[PDB]
Amino acid sequence: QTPTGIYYEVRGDTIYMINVTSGEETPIHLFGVNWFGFETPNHVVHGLWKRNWEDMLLQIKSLGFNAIRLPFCTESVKPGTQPIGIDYSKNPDLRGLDSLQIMEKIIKKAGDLGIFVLLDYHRIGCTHIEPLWYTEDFSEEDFINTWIEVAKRFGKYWNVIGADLKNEPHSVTSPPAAYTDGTGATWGMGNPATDWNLAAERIGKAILKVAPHWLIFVEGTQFTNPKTDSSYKWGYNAWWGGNLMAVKDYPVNLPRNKLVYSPHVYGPDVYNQPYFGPAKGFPDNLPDIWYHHFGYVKLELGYSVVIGAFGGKYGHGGDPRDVIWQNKLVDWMIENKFCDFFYWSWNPDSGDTGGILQDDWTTIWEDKYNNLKRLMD
Ligand SMILES: OC[C@H]1O[C@@H](O[C@H]2[C@H](O)[C@@H](O)[C@H](O[C@H]3[C@H](O)[C@@H](O)[C@H](O[C@H]4[C@H](O)[C@@H](O)[C@H](O)O[C@@H]4CO)O[C@@H]3CO)O[C@@H]2CO)[C@H](O)[C@@H](O)[C@@H]1O
Numbered sequence: 001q002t003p004t005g006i007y008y009e010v011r012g013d014t015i016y017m018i019n020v021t022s023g024e025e026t027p028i029h030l031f032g033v034n035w036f037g038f039e040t041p042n043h044v045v046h047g048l049w050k051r052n053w054e055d056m057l058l059q060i061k062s063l064g065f066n067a068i069r070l071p072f073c074t075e076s077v078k079p080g081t082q083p084i085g086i087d088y089s090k091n092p093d094l095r096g097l098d099s100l101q102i103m104e105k106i107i108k109k110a111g112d113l114g115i116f117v118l119l120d121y122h123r124i125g126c127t128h129i130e131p132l133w134y135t136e137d138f139s140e141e142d143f144i145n146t147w148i149e150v151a152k153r154f155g156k157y158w159n160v161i162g163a164d165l166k167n168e169p170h171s172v173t174s175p176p177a178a179y180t181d182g183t184g185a186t187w188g189m190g191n192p193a194t195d196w197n198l199a200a201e202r203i204g205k206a207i208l209k210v211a212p213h214w215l216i217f218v219e220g221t222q223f224t225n226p227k228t229d230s231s232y233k234w235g236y237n238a239w240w241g242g243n244l245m246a247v248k249d250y251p252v253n254l255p256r257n258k259l260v261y262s263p264h265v266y267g268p269d270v271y272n273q274p275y276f277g278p279a280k281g282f283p284d285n286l287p288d289i290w291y292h293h294f295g296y297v298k299l300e301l302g303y304s305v306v307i308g309a310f311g312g313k314y315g316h317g318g319d320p321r322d323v324i325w326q327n328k329l330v331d332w333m334i335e336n337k338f339c340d341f342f343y344w345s346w347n348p349d350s351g352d353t354g355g356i357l358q359d360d361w362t363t364i365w366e367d368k369y370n371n372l373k374r375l376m377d
Pocket residue numbers: 036037039071168236237238239240241242264266270271349350351352353
């Protein structure tokens with residue numbers, strides 16, 4: 001039931017942490033951040049060329065966080081991979097090892113601070129986010145077998161709540177072609193080879209045999225199926241990993257208490273959505289959009305919903321209307337009790353969102369930040 005003694009499960013729409021020995025059943029809430037860079041060639045979380053890692057953690061935590069999502073790619077996971085671009089004068093603690101260890105160690109330090117960790121299979125390649133959980137030179141079986149391996153080492157770390165099966169399933173072409181052309185993910189279309197809802201069942205089942213104590217995080221797709229997407233005005237405008245409109249009629253076939261739907265959502269910085277325009281309704285049009293794209297999955301369906309990645313900067317690195325966006329969003333999450341989230345990113349170098357911070361990998365965006373603590377409150 002659990003090697004660790006800690007069993008994670010979903011009750012109602014709340015994530016519970018259950019100490020199987022003592023019997024304590026504790027509802028937990030995830031106030032997290034995305035510590036990216038493990039889905040990269042540098043093979044390490046970023047910003048370490050300017051600072052020490054626990055300072056990052058300590059700094060993280062002290063800001064009020066209890067969980068971090070660690071994006072990774074296939075190589076980061078296999079033994080001999082070497083990171084790159086780090087300043088050892090600052091971090092001389094880890095000597096000679098597999099981005100897997102700095103990784104393992106990062107997880108270790110996080111738990112001492114009582115921080116939970118969500119493992120995310122971000123990229124098969126260390127370059128970009130493929131639209132599918134397989135490629136010409138990398139098969140689904142290779143993907144699943146890799147998730148199994150990852151479910152073994154990292155399975156033992158008590159603060160690891162589960163697996164984000166695949167980071168941002170999406171399309172690389174537009175509908176109606178995208179639906180039946182096989183280059184992109186779908187949901188409720190029919191073909192088990194592109195339907196993420198069926199693939200998620202196959203991958204998740206494999207993961208639960210090895211880590212039955214874990215939670216299965218299933219993100220949305222970009223497009224699902226013509227009938228579903230055409231049912232809502234902004235149906236064709238959801239984010240990669242942000243379309244959960246097909247959950248009602250095409251629920252992933254996995255035990256309800258192990259399943260967590262994890263949509264991704266963003267503002268003006270990442271991509272200039274059309275409903276972001278005052279002409280259409282920004283920003284008061286936002287509640288109904290979030291609702292339709294994924295909100296109803298918890299509010300109406302009763303499933304556990306965790307925002308796996310959202311972020312940007314109420315700010316200047318670029319666009320201002322992002323201020324109104326991140327505001328209206330946190331307001332919204334509070335009104336509806338969406339208290340489990342993962343900010344993107346704690347890394348200032350997200351050319352489209354920066355971290356929760358600033359490039360001298362030192363200071364945090366005060367206002368961008370004061371807005372987010374409200375939720376943790
Ligand atoms: O991983 C480290 C790396 O991260 C980079 O940031 C990534 C984001 O993490 C990722 O979520 C983001 O994905 C975007 C994509 O770039 C946009 O082009 C795409 O826009 C979509 C839109 O979402 C759809 O609604 C619309 O219909 O189609 C458009 C595309 O035409 O939206 C997705 C998110 O849903 O990509 C970022 C990178 O570009 C950092 O930038 C990098 O520095 C970090 O090293």
